């Protein structure tokens, strides 16, 4: 792993964000609004989907 760290960044290509990361995007006010596409995932307080 430590030696092939450079091989990962060698590929000049982008990565998708996780839904948890895209979910942090929203302010408390508009987390509940229809504009939050990640709501279909927030099913359980104690578990993430």
């Amino acid at each position: 792993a430590a030696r092939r760290i450079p091989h990962f960044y060698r590929v000049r290509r982008e990565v998708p964000r996780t839904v948890n990361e895209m979910k942090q995007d929203f302010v408390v006010t508009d987390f509940y609004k229809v504009g939050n596409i990640t709501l279909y995932t927030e099913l359980h307080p104690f578990f993430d989907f």
């Binding site: 995007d25 929203f26 302010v27 006010t29 508009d30």
Partner: protein, 49 residues
């Protein structure tokens, strides 16, 4: 002398001409440089600025 095709117009110097010399005037000159465009509007509004 091409003001109208310039990036910073007369209100910038009109502000900096009398602003007090504290850090807040620096931050204000920075926040005045927020672009006005649909992308910039959505980015500012989602942040509730």
């Amino acid at each position: 002398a091409h003001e109208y095709h310039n990036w910073l117009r007369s209100p910038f110097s009109r502000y900096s001409a009398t602003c007090p010399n504290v850090l807040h005037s620096v931050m204000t000159l920075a926040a005045m440089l927020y672009k006005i465009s649909p992308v910039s509007l959505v980015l500012q509004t989602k942040a509730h600025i």
